[PDB]
Amino acid sequence: TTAAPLLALLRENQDSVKTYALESINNVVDQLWSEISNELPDIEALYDDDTFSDREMAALIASKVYYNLGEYESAVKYALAAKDRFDIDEKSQFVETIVSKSIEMYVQEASKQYTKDEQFYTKDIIDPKLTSIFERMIEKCLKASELKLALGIALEGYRLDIIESALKSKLDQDSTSENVKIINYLLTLAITTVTNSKFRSSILRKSFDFLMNMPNCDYLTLNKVVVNLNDAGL
Amino acid sequence: LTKSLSIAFENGDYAACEKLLPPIKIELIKNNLLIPDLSIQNDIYLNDLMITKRILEVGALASIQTFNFDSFENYFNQLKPYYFSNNHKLSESDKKSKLISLYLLNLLSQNNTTKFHSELQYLDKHIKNLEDDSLLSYPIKLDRWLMEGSYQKAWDLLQSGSQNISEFDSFTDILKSAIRDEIAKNTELSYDFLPLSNIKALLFFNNEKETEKFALERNWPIVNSKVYFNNQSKEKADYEDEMMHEEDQKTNIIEKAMDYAISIEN
Amino acid sequence: TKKKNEEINKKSLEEDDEFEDFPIDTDDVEVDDDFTNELKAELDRYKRENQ
Amino acid sequence: LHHSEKKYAEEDQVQELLKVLNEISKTTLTLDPRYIWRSLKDLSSLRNQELLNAETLCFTVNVLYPDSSSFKKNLLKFITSNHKSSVPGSAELRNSYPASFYSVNTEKKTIEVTAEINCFMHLLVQLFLWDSKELEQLVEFNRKVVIPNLLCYYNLRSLNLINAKLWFYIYLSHETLARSSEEINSDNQNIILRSTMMKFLKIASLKHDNETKAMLINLILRDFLNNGEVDSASDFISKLEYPHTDVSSSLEARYFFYLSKINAIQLDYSTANEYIIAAIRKAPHNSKSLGFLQQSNKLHCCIQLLMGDIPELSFFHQSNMQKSLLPYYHLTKAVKLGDLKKFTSTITKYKQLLLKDDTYQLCVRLRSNVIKTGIRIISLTYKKISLRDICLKLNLDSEQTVEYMVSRAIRDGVIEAKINHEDGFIETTELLNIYDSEDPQQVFDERIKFANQLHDEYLVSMRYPEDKKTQQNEK
């Protein structure tokens, strides 16, 4: 259909017709996506006003419009603007476009700010929406329950608590050897991947006590940690 | 309720119509749920679509006369896909024909020959011989004489348009003004001097004093019965020359050597 | 056999070939100017001479 | 007799199938499967005709089928059902080998090797449908099936290269029904066709498949054109993303034609000139692409005359395209001789033919162009001419009328003159010696820059195949 009808519905003066127009647009937002792209200022204008009880909806419409056009940055920021109604994306596997975007961006910021203070996450320097999204993609990896995925996203972003906490929940000594092998990968991964001097050292030192905790543990794995830090005290 | 609007138009108070339209817009949500939004038509559905169109139609027409551009464009916007859909069964009317004419005349008045030709392609099959050319003929003729650039024919058509006015006057008055600016441009490149009479005759003013008045508004001085196109035109180019975009657009010969080298050495 | 898919696909977008549809349904202009010139030369001449 | 030929036909398909299967299932060697897949289509369409066309039926019977059997029955039903040992799985010659697909393990769901074989079957059916000219029930059924079949998958780049062909027949089949035959329902399902193309288009950026993305843009634009939505096309192309990288030069020619058409009607002729010339070059010039060429050469001429350029009379003559370009020839002359009345009769006479290609609406604009040209002839021939003399020359009504044609024309610089009111004549003003001026410098500069671009394209292309060869073992 022409998108043309909707665009005129938005142009009417009174707020009442404008509010209604949103709903009809949202069911045809991906169909007619191409036409509406040209009409991005109206979508922004609706959002700015505070009369609308569909203010969240309007930001979400824009979000959609921006990713299809190909401006990925503007889309993810608009995703946290709405905040809610982002539910639809969380439970659809055909649009995880904005979510995946969120991780790429979030980690790059976090790595840079690690060097300043390593508790950057516990500060609100990170936006509060993003803090919620990051922990929920970690949760999807845990759903599949291979712990390696969970560890890998955090290893790149130089999250120090997450490396620790993952290992503590898999301390349970069902078989001591299996526990040890997931650690074997993690020690190796971190040398060849992590170059940032501070992040790497720190998780290595923590992992030494985690192996020592188990009364029975392979020591090939363990020896690597001590010689790398080269602390006689260890 | 829905009929109160139809009778408000005939009364003649077209401001009553406008004040009544925010209430009837709420009822336009209901008409929309009745129709499946253009996804299959049946005999339940043809009535429903019909009521939706009646409300819009007297609104289209009312807005035009009250020079309220916004409302007209929207109402019309809706009318367009509805009429376009489907096979004939009641999807054309006398009201359609009038509405498209008025629409095309707005586009001629904004001087947007770009959209007009495109809009004509979209419309094409419906106006070929199933509304024909009767009222729609008025802008088609009008485009033809100004492309040829016989301003004499064009002008004559608007005045003689008096016997055709039905609400056409909202585009027709404007379309005179548009003619004056196109001609005004032309006559500069040709010459520098016209007598008083000649200025009036080309631009089609009916008053000689109104001529001289227009000349000041057009930023032309007429002195001792002669235009002196010489001033402003030169002034404008000198003013245009100061701006900022500006080095690569103007093109420097210096720049040509610099750009050539870095191509090679890359 | 590779190019062939494309040749058939183009034809179909045209529909048939118009090429053969048209016959089923249904300064090179410059006259010899010698003839006109003959007339011109003679009329001018008659007057010129007896002037 | 029958049995023999059917079998033979069957064998041939099976050979081809295994080879392309091997290639894909043994690492990503992408180019090789793709080049192969295009040639196979031609080969398959050519095959069917002889060795009997129940090659398909045989092959379906003898796979680990999911609903291909159910499909096949629908196909036989349209064109009258028969039974001659066509019960699904009446043929077992698979015989528990992985090669032709291990019968037991597929059924259990410990392996699913049916995947690409089902995709391939849908391709064979589509292809066979259009060749045959089987329509109605099948088209609908086929469209229905395949759309959810693709959305079950979460495609690989290699599998997407394959649906890059399937959507062209999907588009085309829908159109054939819409084109035969008036329906309200055709109109309704045109909306739905757009919608799905657009959905698949967003996905194919992320999947990084240049081939698929291109194809979809060809289809969508063509759709806007038929229903005459120029506005829709103009918006769609400007979020430009169409790659010239992986795509066939067959596809490039179609793409550039759509560009040209939309520019034509809004009076932009500068951009339309270049795109049109390119599609001519790009197109393979062969016996059956000749239809495309004809349609295009009718447009290219229109674009030129509108610009104000005059196409050769020589061109139409020595071409093997003479007869179709008969109307065209009459227009070219009519503008040249500057006769308005003849122009008017000519487009009326040819009205039906022109109208099909929809170049007719362009022809109507060509009414101005006749007159304008006549005013250039007069300026060139006679530098200083009383305005009285032009009126007689072009048969125009009065002194005031010619005033008005020249005046509009010199704004556009066609004539390039100025009227001298006082003296009561017109002066040509273009009087050459632009050498002395800075002008040649400007001219050459563009040429120099253009060479450089051709160099970079040349350099780039040349080196790439060597690299692949050198790495590979070679004697």
Side-chain angles (χ1 to χ4, degrees), chain D residues 389-414:
Chain D
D389 290 346
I390 295 168
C391 292
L392 180 54
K393 287 180 177 298
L394 300 177
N395 304 273
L396 309 164
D397 294 47
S398 56
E399 304 192 4
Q400 207 69 60
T401 295
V402 81
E403 173 275 308
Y404 282 130
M405 314 299 188
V406 168
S407 273
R408 180 260 186 192
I410 65 171
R411 179 181 73 191
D412 306 307
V414 175

PDB file of all heavy atoms in Angstrom, chain D residues 389-414:
ATOM      1  N   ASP D 389      10.069  37.908 -40.115  1.00  0.00           N
ATOM      2  CA  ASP D 389      10.502  36.885 -41.009  1.00  0.00           C
ATOM      3  C   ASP D 389      10.360  35.555 -40.300  1.00  0.00           C
ATOM      4  O   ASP D 389       9.950  34.589 -40.882  1.00  0.00           O
ATOM      5  CB  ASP D 389      11.919  37.149 -41.456  1.00  0.00           C
ATOM      6  CG  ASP D 389      12.008  38.348 -42.380  1.00  0.00           C
ATOM      7  OD1 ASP D 389      10.982  38.783 -42.850  1.00  0.00           O
ATOM      8  OD2 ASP D 389      13.096  38.817 -42.613  1.00  0.00           O
ATOM      9  N   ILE D 390      10.591  35.443 -39.000  1.00  0.00           N
ATOM     10  CA  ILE D 390      10.557  34.111 -38.317  1.00  0.00           C
ATOM     11  C   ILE D 390       9.160  33.638 -38.403  1.00  0.00           C
ATOM     12  O   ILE D 390       8.940  32.482 -38.723  1.00  0.00           O
ATOM     13  CB  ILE D 390      10.974  34.212 -36.871  1.00  0.00           C
ATOM     14  CG1 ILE D 390      12.431  34.622 -36.791  1.00  0.00           C
ATOM     15  CG2 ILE D 390      10.778  32.850 -36.238  1.00  0.00           C
ATOM     16  CD1 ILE D 390      12.864  35.014 -35.408  1.00  0.00           C
ATOM     17  N   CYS D 391       8.141  34.540 -38.108  1.00  0.00           N
ATOM     18  CA  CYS D 391       6.744  34.199 -38.085  1.00  0.00           C
ATOM     19  C   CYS D 391       6.227  33.537 -39.317  1.00  0.00           C
ATOM     20  O   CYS D 391       5.403  32.641 -39.244  1.00  0.00           O
ATOM     21  CB  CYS D 391       5.898  35.436 -37.799  1.00  0.00           C
ATOM     22  SG  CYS D 391       6.087  36.084 -36.127  1.00  0.00           S
ATOM     23  N   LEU D 392       6.671  34.018 -40.480  1.00  0.00           N
ATOM     24  CA  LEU D 392       6.355  33.474 -41.766  1.00  0.00           C
ATOM     25  C   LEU D 392       7.015  32.138 -41.896  1.00  0.00           C
ATOM     26  O   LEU D 392       6.474  31.196 -42.484  1.00  0.00           O
ATOM     27  CB  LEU D 392       7.027  34.388 -42.754  1.00  0.00           C
ATOM     28  CG  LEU D 392       6.853  34.056 -44.236  1.00  0.00           C
ATOM     29  CD1 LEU D 392       5.465  33.913 -44.717  1.00  0.00           C
ATOM     30  CD2 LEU D 392       7.670  35.123 -44.928  1.00  0.00           C
ATOM     31  N   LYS D 393       8.245  32.010 -41.414  1.00  0.00           N
ATOM     32  CA  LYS D 393       9.068  30.841 -41.563  1.00  0.00           C
ATOM     33  C   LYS D 393       8.479  29.667 -40.803  1.00  0.00           C
ATOM     34  O   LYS D 393       8.524  28.562 -41.337  1.00  0.00           O
ATOM     35  CB  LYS D 393      10.514  31.084 -41.127  1.00  0.00           C
ATOM     36  CG  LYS D 393      11.319  31.939 -42.085  1.00  0.00           C
ATOM     37  CD  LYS D 393      12.736  32.144 -41.588  1.00  0.00           C
ATOM     38  CE  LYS D 393      13.537  32.943 -42.597  1.00  0.00           C
ATOM     39  NZ  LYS D 393      13.642  32.217 -43.895  1.00  0.00           N
ATOM     40  N   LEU D 394       7.962  29.874 -39.564  1.00  0.00           N
ATOM     41  CA  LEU D 394       7.459  28.789 -38.790  1.00  0.00           C
ATOM     42  C   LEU D 394       5.989  28.732 -38.695  1.00  0.00           C
ATOM     43  O   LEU D 394       5.419  27.992 -37.910  1.00  0.00           O
ATOM     44  CB  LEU D 394       8.042  28.870 -37.376  1.00  0.00           C
ATOM     45  CG  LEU D 394       9.568  28.810 -37.273  1.00  0.00           C
ATOM     46  CD1 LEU D 394       9.980  28.980 -35.814  1.00  0.00           C
ATOM     47  CD2 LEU D 394      10.065  27.490 -37.835  1.00  0.00           C
ATOM     48  N   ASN D 395       5.394  29.584 -39.486  1.00  0.00           N
ATOM     49  CA  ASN D 395       3.990  29.611 -39.734  1.00  0.00           C
ATOM     50  C   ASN D 395       3.222  30.170 -38.550  1.00  0.00           C
ATOM     51  O   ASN D 395       1.985  30.110 -38.495  1.00  0.00           O
ATOM     52  CB  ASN D 395       3.321  28.307 -40.228  1.00  0.00           C
ATOM     53  CG  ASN D 395       4.008  27.830 -41.473  1.00  0.00           C
ATOM     54  OD1 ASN D 395       3.538  28.325 -42.500  1.00  0.00           O
ATOM     55  ND2 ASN D 395       4.991  26.977 -41.367  1.00  0.00           N
ATOM     56  N   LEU D 396       3.951  30.595 -37.516  1.00  0.00           N
ATOM     57  CA  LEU D 396       3.454  31.120 -36.261  1.00  0.00           C
ATOM     58  C   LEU D 396       2.753  32.387 -36.507  1.00  0.00           C
ATOM     59  O   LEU D 396       3.054  33.297 -37.262  1.00  0.00           O
ATOM     60  CB  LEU D 396       4.470  31.387 -35.134  1.00  0.00           C
ATOM     61  CG  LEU D 396       5.479  30.269 -34.701  1.00  0.00           C
ATOM     62  CD1 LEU D 396       6.630  30.832 -33.881  1.00  0.00           C
ATOM     63  CD2 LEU D 396       4.687  29.276 -33.915  1.00  0.00           C
ATOM     64  N   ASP D 397       1.660  32.539 -35.648  1.00  0.00           N
ATOM     65  CA  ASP D 397       0.497  33.384 -35.790  1.00  0.00           C
ATOM     66  C   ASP D 397       0.850  34.889 -35.776  1.00  0.00           C
ATOM     67  O   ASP D 397       0.313  35.476 -36.684  1.00  0.00           O
ATOM     68  CB  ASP D 397      -0.598  33.147 -34.709  1.00  0.00           C
ATOM     69  CG  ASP D 397      -1.167  31.754 -34.910  1.00  0.00           C
ATOM     70  OD1 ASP D 397      -0.424  30.739 -35.083  1.00  0.00           O
ATOM     71  OD2 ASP D 397      -2.415  31.683 -34.990  1.00  0.00           O
ATOM     72  N   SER D 398       1.669  35.433 -34.784  1.00  0.00           N
ATOM     73  CA  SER D 398       1.775  36.858 -34.745  1.00  0.00           C
ATOM     74  C   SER D 398       3.089  37.109 -34.120  1.00  0.00           C
ATOM     75  O   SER D 398       3.814  36.183 -33.762  1.00  0.00           O
ATOM     76  CB  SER D 398       0.625  37.517 -33.935  1.00  0.00           C
ATOM     77  OG  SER D 398       0.555  37.015 -32.668  1.00  0.00           O
ATOM     78  N   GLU D 399       3.409  38.374 -34.107  1.00  0.00           N
ATOM     79  CA  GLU D 399       4.718  38.868 -33.673  1.00  0.00           C
ATOM     80  C   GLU D 399       4.997  38.590 -32.166  1.00  0.00           C
ATOM     81  O   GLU D 399       6.154  38.337 -31.789  1.00  0.00           O
ATOM     82  CB  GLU D 399       4.871  40.467 -33.771  1.00  0.00           C
ATOM     83  CG  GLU D 399       4.569  40.963 -35.220  1.00  0.00           C
ATOM     84  CD  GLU D 399       5.053  42.410 -35.233  1.00  0.00           C
ATOM     85  OE1 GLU D 399       5.624  42.880 -34.212  1.00  0.00           O
ATOM     86  OE2 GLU D 399       4.934  43.070 -36.332  1.00  0.00           O
ATOM     87  N   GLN D 400       3.887  38.740 -31.375  1.00  0.00           N
ATOM     88  CA  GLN D 400       3.859  38.535 -29.975  1.00  0.00           C
ATOM     89  C   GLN D 400       4.168  37.084 -29.703  1.00  0.00           C
ATOM     90  O   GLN D 400       4.838  36.719 -28.743  1.00  0.00           O
ATOM     91  CB  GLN D 400       2.456  38.714 -29.370  1.00  0.00           C
ATOM     92  CG  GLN D 400       2.536  39.148 -27.917  1.00  0.00           C
ATOM     93  CD  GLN D 400       3.082  40.581 -27.794  1.00  0.00           C
ATOM     94  OE1 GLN D 400       2.418  41.463 -28.369  1.00  0.00           O
ATOM     95  NE2 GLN D 400       4.223  40.797 -27.199  1.00  0.00           N
ATOM     96  N   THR D 401       3.738  36.117 -30.573  1.00  0.00           N
ATOM     97  CA  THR D 401       3.934  34.654 -30.290  1.00  0.00           C
ATOM     98  C   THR D 401       5.382  34.248 -30.433  1.00  0.00           C
ATOM     99  O   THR D 401       5.900  33.486 -29.597  1.00  0.00           O
ATOM    100  CB  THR D 401       3.016  33.727 -31.152  1.00  0.00           C
ATOM    101  OG1 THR D 401       1.673  34.030 -30.735  1.00  0.00           O
ATOM    102  CG2 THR D 401       3.251  32.254 -30.883  1.00  0.00           C
ATOM    103  N   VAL D 402       6.050  34.691 -31.439  1.00  0.00           N
ATOM    104  CA  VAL D 402       7.414  34.302 -31.643  1.00  0.00           C
ATOM    105  C   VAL D 402       8.168  34.961 -30.543  1.00  0.00           C
ATOM    106  O   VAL D 402       9.088  34.301 -30.205  1.00  0.00           O
ATOM    107  CB  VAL D 402       7.880  34.577 -33.040  1.00  0.00           C
ATOM    108  CG1 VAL D 402       8.319  36.071 -33.321  1.00  0.00           C
ATOM    109  CG2 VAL D 402       9.107  33.599 -33.217  1.00  0.00           C
ATOM    110  N   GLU D 403       7.841  36.222 -30.083  1.00  0.00           N
ATOM    111  CA  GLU D 403       8.489  36.831 -28.988  1.00  0.00           C
ATOM    112  C   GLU D 403       8.610  35.847 -27.873  1.00  0.00           C
ATOM    113  O   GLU D 403       9.749  35.530 -27.442  1.00  0.00           O
ATOM    114  CB  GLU D 403       7.904  38.234 -28.564  1.00  0.00           C
ATOM    115  CG  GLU D 403       8.528  38.809 -27.218  1.00  0.00           C
ATOM    116  CD  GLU D 403       7.657  38.131 -26.184  1.00  0.00           C
ATOM    117  OE1 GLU D 403       6.376  38.217 -26.287  1.00  0.00           O
ATOM    118  OE2 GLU D 403       8.251  37.549 -25.233  1.00  0.00           O
ATOM    119  N   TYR D 404       7.470  35.240 -27.521  1.00  0.00           N
ATOM    120  CA  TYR D 404       7.336  34.303 -26.420  1.00  0.00           C
ATOM    121  C   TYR D 404       8.022  33.023 -26.600  1.00  0.00           C
ATOM    122  O   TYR D 404       8.440  32.516 -25.544  1.00  0.00           O
ATOM    123  CB  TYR D 404       5.866  34.051 -26.110  1.00  0.00           C
ATOM    124  CG  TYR D 404       5.212  35.163 -25.329  1.00  0.00           C
ATOM    125  CD1 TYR D 404       4.009  35.700 -25.750  1.00  0.00           C
ATOM    126  CD2 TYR D 404       5.826  35.645 -24.180  1.00  0.00           C
ATOM    127  CE1 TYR D 404       3.419  36.711 -25.018  1.00  0.00           C
ATOM    128  CE2 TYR D 404       5.237  36.657 -23.449  1.00  0.00           C
ATOM    129  CZ  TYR D 404       4.036  37.185 -23.866  1.00  0.00           C
ATOM    130  OH  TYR D 404       3.437  38.186 -23.144  1.00  0.00           O
ATOM    131  N   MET D 405       8.161  32.380 -27.845  1.00  0.00           N
ATOM    132  CA  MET D 405       8.976  31.166 -27.926  1.00  0.00           C
ATOM    133  C   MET D 405      10.438  31.444 -27.696  1.00  0.00           C
ATOM    134  O   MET D 405      11.112  30.665 -27.048  1.00  0.00           O
ATOM    135  CB  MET D 405       8.831  30.452 -29.315  1.00  0.00           C
ATOM    136  CG  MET D 405       7.390  30.288 -29.844  1.00  0.00           C
ATOM    137  SD  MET D 405       6.377  29.261 -28.699  1.00  0.00           S
ATOM    138  CE  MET D 405       4.837  29.045 -29.684  1.00  0.00           C
ATOM    139  N   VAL D 406      11.035  32.521 -28.359  1.00  0.00           N
ATOM    140  CA  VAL D 406      12.490  32.720 -28.321  1.00  0.00           C
ATOM    141  C   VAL D 406      12.787  32.958 -26.814  1.00  0.00           C
ATOM    142  O   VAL D 406      13.724  32.351 -26.334  1.00  0.00           O
ATOM    143  CB  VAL D 406      13.005  33.849 -29.149  1.00  0.00           C
ATOM    144  CG1 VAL D 406      14.491  34.110 -28.748  1.00  0.00           C
ATOM    145  CG2 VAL D 406      12.850  33.526 -30.689  1.00  0.00           C
ATOM    146  N   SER D 407      11.999  33.827 -26.137  1.00  0.00           N
ATOM    147  CA  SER D 407      12.187  34.299 -24.808  1.00  0.00           C
ATOM    148  C   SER D 407      12.257  33.155 -23.869  1.00  0.00           C
ATOM    149  O   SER D 407      13.205  33.050 -23.059  1.00  0.00           O
ATOM    150  CB  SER D 407      11.117  35.232 -24.292  1.00  0.00           C
ATOM    151  OG  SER D 407      11.548  36.587 -24.732  1.00  0.00           O
ATOM    152  N   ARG D 408      11.451  32.112 -23.931  1.00  0.00           N
ATOM    153  CA  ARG D 408      11.525  30.978 -23.036  1.00  0.00           C
ATOM    154  C   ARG D 408      12.732  30.169 -23.411  1.00  0.00           C
ATOM    155  O   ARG D 408      13.510  29.611 -22.570  1.00  0.00           O
ATOM    156  CB  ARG D 408      10.300  30.103 -23.165  1.00  0.00           C
ATOM    157  CG  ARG D 408      10.263  28.862 -22.248  1.00  0.00           C
ATOM    158  CD  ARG D 408      10.676  27.536 -22.936  1.00  0.00           C
ATOM    159  NE  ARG D 408      10.431  26.452 -21.939  1.00  0.00           N
ATOM    160  CZ  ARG D 408      10.875  25.186 -22.068  1.00  0.00           C
ATOM    161  NH1 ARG D 408      11.529  24.748 -23.203  1.00  0.00           N
ATOM    162  NH2 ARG D 408      10.783  24.362 -20.953  1.00  0.00           N
ATOM    163  N   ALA D 409      13.052  30.005 -24.715  1.00  0.00           N
ATOM    164  CA  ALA D 409      14.133  29.138 -25.197  1.00  0.00           C
ATOM    165  C   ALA D 409      15.529  29.663 -24.750  1.00  0.00           C
ATOM    166  O   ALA D 409      16.440  28.942 -24.515  1.00  0.00           O
ATOM    167  CB  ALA D 409      13.999  28.863 -26.706  1.00  0.00           C
ATOM    168  N   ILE D 410      15.751  30.997 -24.643  1.00  0.00           N
ATOM    169  CA  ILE D 410      17.072  31.477 -24.418  1.00  0.00           C
ATOM    170  C   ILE D 410      17.383  31.462 -22.935  1.00  0.00           C
ATOM    171  O   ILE D 410      18.545  31.613 -22.561  1.00  0.00           O
ATOM    172  CB  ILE D 410      17.240  32.899 -24.983  1.00  0.00           C
ATOM    173  CG1 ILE D 410      16.354  33.887 -24.219  1.00  0.00           C
ATOM    174  CG2 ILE D 410      16.913  32.926 -26.468  1.00  0.00           C
ATOM    175  CD1 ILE D 410      16.615  35.335 -24.562  1.00  0.00           C
ATOM    176  N   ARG D 411      16.363  31.173 -22.093  1.00  0.00           N
ATOM    177  CA  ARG D 411      16.635  30.957 -20.722  1.00  0.00           C
ATOM    178  C   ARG D 411      17.447  29.657 -20.630  1.00  0.00           C
ATOM    179  O   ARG D 411      18.293  29.498 -19.772  1.00  0.00           O
ATOM    180  CB  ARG D 411      15.266  30.771 -19.989  1.00  0.00           C
ATOM    181  CG  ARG D 411      15.228  30.476 -18.432  1.00  0.00           C
ATOM    182  CD  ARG D 411      13.796  30.287 -17.856  1.00  0.00           C
ATOM    183  NE  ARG D 411      13.254  28.982 -18.280  1.00  0.00           N
ATOM    184  CZ  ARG D 411      11.918  28.615 -18.113  1.00  0.00           C
ATOM    185  NH1 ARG D 411      10.958  29.543 -17.725  1.00  0.00           N
ATOM    186  NH2 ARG D 411      11.503  27.416 -18.554  1.00  0.00           N
ATOM    187  N   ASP D 412      17.186  28.653 -21.521  1.00  0.00           N
ATOM    188  CA  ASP D 412      17.727  27.278 -21.492  1.00  0.00           C
ATOM    189  C   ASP D 412      18.955  27.264 -22.309  1.00  0.00           C
ATOM    190  O   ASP D 412      19.795  26.354 -22.174  1.00  0.00           O
ATOM    191  CB  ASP D 412      16.791  26.117 -21.968  1.00  0.00           C
ATOM    192  CG  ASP D 412      15.518  26.276 -21.123  1.00  0.00           C
ATOM    193  OD1 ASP D 412      15.648  26.327 -19.889  1.00  0.00           O
ATOM    194  OD2 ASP D 412      14.400  26.433 -21.719  1.00  0.00           O
ATOM    195  N   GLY D 413      19.166  28.281 -23.136  1.00  0.00           N
ATOM    196  CA  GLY D 413      20.470  28.486 -23.793  1.00  0.00           C
ATOM    197  C   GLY D 413      20.558  27.628 -25.003  1.00  0.00           C
ATOM    198  O   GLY D 413      21.635  27.472 -25.555  1.00  0.00           O
ATOM    199  N   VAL D 414      19.419  27.114 -25.441  1.00  0.00           N
ATOM    200  CA  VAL D 414      19.348  26.285 -26.614  1.00  0.00           C
ATOM    201  C   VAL D 414      19.751  27.104 -27.812  1.00  0.00           C
ATOM    202  O   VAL D 414      20.645  26.782 -28.583  1.00  0.00           O
ATOM    203  CB  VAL D 414      17.953  25.606 -26.932  1.00  0.00           C
ATOM    204  CG1 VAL D 414      17.890  24.841 -28.216  1.00  0.00           C
ATOM    205  CG2 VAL D 414      17.796  24.616 -25.739  1.00  0.00           C
TER     206      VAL D 414
END
